[PDB]
């Protein structure tokens, strides 16, 4: 693309400096630059390329979420017709979003989940995949919106499958996973109860192998556990 | 307030 | 532009959508959509032009102060060396802000002050040329260097010397055209006294005039004229 | 910490 004349580890090393600038759309394009070099992701490479399409999507998501609250008052009794503009520009906004999310998808299939062996990759990815097909699925209204949802299950089913099998119950990957698919549960799935069992069983399951870790693994994990508890708050 | 993902 | 095919008042109305939504670099291209018409601005109109690329600049320049002091240490004895990437990268990011502060200077000599006659547009206009060169001088080390200084002086002169004909002395574009032109004395001119002198001044003369406000424009200028004290706070 | 401009 317009990053292949860059050496990868330029691109690694602009996608840092970019993190420490807040320049997170630079930071997205440095690392898909990266992704596009044809070879697999170290942990950290990884976590700068969820880093980056996280905060660039997130702005997305809450600038179509501050429209799609406009443009839903613009509709009920008693206001006033203002034209096309607020339905033209959530649509704007809307398309930009679905952009970076068939961007990140398109870097997942070609080729980062196809070669990724252990479980700590593949599991990230397949998070990443179902983390994607989510945000597609929290602005579709067509006739897609079905099959949306579904591939975000499907993904999100497949990372379940070989977290559980291959990594211990306080694996922060683990436990983001969960704590995501559970959110896919009650915010998209209409399946709050499958939500509410899911925190509450990884909350406890992870809460019995905290005495296996070091005082940093320990740190890394509570703090996920605290989001789950965060949302059982939330929800119950 | 916002549920929580990571 | 790419704007040519809407309507001016659509443009409008999607600059204050973009606001609320924080989508301040649209924001921006809608407005320069909306000045690209060739209808003079009115001031809630102004305001948004001003709002929406002080933000894009204003997210600009503080990745660049983040750049600028990375590559200062890299550039400190005992630094080991790391290549071209740290300066390469706050070169695309000066860059893309040279190019901001380029857009918003043409649109205010094309046609911007030319058409401005009364105070408040004129003003309005002439600060803001002074803030743009003040913004090009901040990043600028070339043979150009003291050219940009003296643009960005002459345009605050400018505005300095209808404002002070034409606006009472508590007028809050004649209060933050004094506070900006003090910052760019203290920080681009080196010279502090007459940022002090003039932040002073400017502070007792809005005073004196206090009493002929109204409670409405009376917390107007009482906002600003606390800008100028905390910076006479700061530099003494 | 930072000086003020508007
Ligand atoms: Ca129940
Ligand atoms: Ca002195
Ligand atoms: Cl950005
Ligand atoms: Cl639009
Ligand atoms: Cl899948
Ligand atoms: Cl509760
Ligand atoms: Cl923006
Ligand atoms: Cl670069
Ligand atoms: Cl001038
Ligand atoms: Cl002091
Ligand atoms: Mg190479
Ligand atoms: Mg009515
Ligand atoms: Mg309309
Ligand atoms: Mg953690
Ligand atoms: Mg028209
Ligand atoms: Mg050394
Ligand atoms: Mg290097
Ligand atoms: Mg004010």
Redesign the interface.
């Given at each position: 693309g317009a990053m292949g004349s860059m050496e990868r580890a330029s691109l690694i090393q602009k996608a840092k400096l970019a993190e420490q600038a807040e320049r997170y759309e630079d930071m997205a394009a440095f690392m898909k630059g990266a992704v596009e070099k044809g070879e697999e992701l170290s942990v950290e490479e990884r976590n700068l390329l969820s880093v980056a399409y996280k905060n660039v999507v997130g702005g997305q998501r809450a600038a179509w979420r501050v429209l799609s609250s406009i443009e839903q008052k613009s509709n009920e009794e008693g206001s006033e017709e203002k034209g096309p503009e607020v339905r033209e520009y959530r649509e704007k906004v809307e398309t930009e979003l679905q952009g970076v999310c068939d961007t990140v998808l398109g870097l997942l299939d070609s080729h980062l989940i196809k070669e990724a062996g252990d479980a700590e990759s593949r599991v990230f990815y397949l998070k990443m995949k179902g983390?994607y097909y989510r945000y597609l699925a929290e602005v579709a209204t067509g006739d897609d919106k079905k099959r949306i949802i579904d591939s975000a299950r499907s993904a999100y089913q497949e990372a379940m499958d070989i977290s559980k099998k291959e990594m211990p119950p306080t694996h922060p990957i683990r436990l983001?996973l969960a704590?995501?698919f559970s959110?896919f549960h009650?915010?998209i799935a209409n399946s709050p109860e499958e939500a509410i069992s899911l925190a509450k069983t990884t909350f406890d399951e992870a809460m019995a192998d905290l005495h296996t870790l070091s005082e940093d693994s320990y740190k890394d994990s509570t703090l996920?556990m605290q989001?789950?508890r965060?949302?059982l708050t939330?929800?119950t | 307030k916002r549920?929580?993902?990571?």
């Open positions: 983390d983001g704590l995501n959110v009650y915010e996920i989001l789950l965060d949302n939330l929800w | 549920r929580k993902s990571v």
